[PDB]
Design a protein around this ligand. Structure first.
Ligand code: ZN
Length: 109
């Protein structure tokens, strides 16, 4: 009953104001033994996806409200290398999607 889809995570974030319990940060996954080049996240952190890290947004692709911050989380991840799907959420709970590895974004909430 894993919450990792665009609609499940977006609805969760907007209701609970945090990610569901299957998410761990990049640092936390690295410390567990995640080696990006080996595509081994599912072996070292079973059931987990990477998420919760601050997203810089220095290229101004996402709208920037002064004082507000963005964070990202992986979507649709089950095993292997990470994919190119990410949910982006602000401290005001605006929610955006990318499926092209942060090239472009579209609003979903
Ligand atoms: Zn770019």
């Amino acid at each position: 009953q894993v919450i990792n889809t665009f609609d499940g995570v977006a609805d969760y974030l907007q209701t609970y104001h945090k990610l569901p319990d299957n998410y761990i940060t990049k640092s936390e996954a690295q410390a567990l033994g995640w080696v990006a080049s080996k595509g081994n996240l599912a072996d070292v952190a079973p059931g987990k996806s990477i998420g919760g890290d601050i997203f810089s947004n220095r290229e101004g692709k996402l709208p920037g409200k002064s004082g507000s911050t963005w964070r990202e989380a992986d979507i649709n991840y089950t095993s292997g290398f990470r994919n190119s799907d990410r949910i982006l959420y602000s401290s005001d709970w605006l929610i955006y999607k990318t499926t092209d590895h942060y090239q472009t974004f579209t609003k979903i909430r």
